[PDB]
Amino acid sequence: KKDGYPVDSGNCKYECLKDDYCNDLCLERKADKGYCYWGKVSCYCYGLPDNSPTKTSGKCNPA
């Protein structure tokens, strides 16, 4: 398990508007708990899957 920014298949960091949205969406990804790191960033979870796809080197692009 590990914490980090859960990015979709194309590296789409699940952005957020409130800490609660990140916590919930965080629990769905399989994280125990997670808040919302604004600072032009995204949601932050804690407990995501080991190999969970997280920010690597992309900008979220439909393809």
Curated annotation (Swiss-Prot):
It is found in: Secreted. Belongs to the long (4 C-C) scorpion toxin superfamily. Sodium channel inhibitor family. Alpha subfamily. PROSITE patterns: LCN_CSAB (PS51863). This is Alpha-toxin CsE5. Expressed by the venom gland. InterPro entries: LCN-type_CS_alpha_beta_dom, Scorpion_toxin-like, Scorpion_toxin-like_sf, Scorpion_toxinL, Scorpion_toxinL/defensin. Residues 2-61 form the LCN-type CS-alpha/beta domain. Its main location: secreted. Gene3D superfamilies: Knottin, scorpion toxin-like. Alpha toxins bind voltage-independently at site-3 of sodium channels (Nav) and inhibit the inactivation of the activated channels, thereby blocking neuronal transmission. One of its GO terms (cellular component) is extracellular region. GO terms for molecular function: sodium channel inhibitor activity; toxin activity. GO terms for biological process: defense response. Has the structural arrangement of an alpha-helix connected to antiparallel beta-sheets by disulfide bonds (CS-alpha/beta). Disulfide bonds join C12-C60, C16-C36, C22-C43, C26-C45. Keywords: Disulfide bond, Ion channel impairing toxin, Neurotoxin, Secreted, Toxin, Voltage-gated sodium channel impairing toxin.
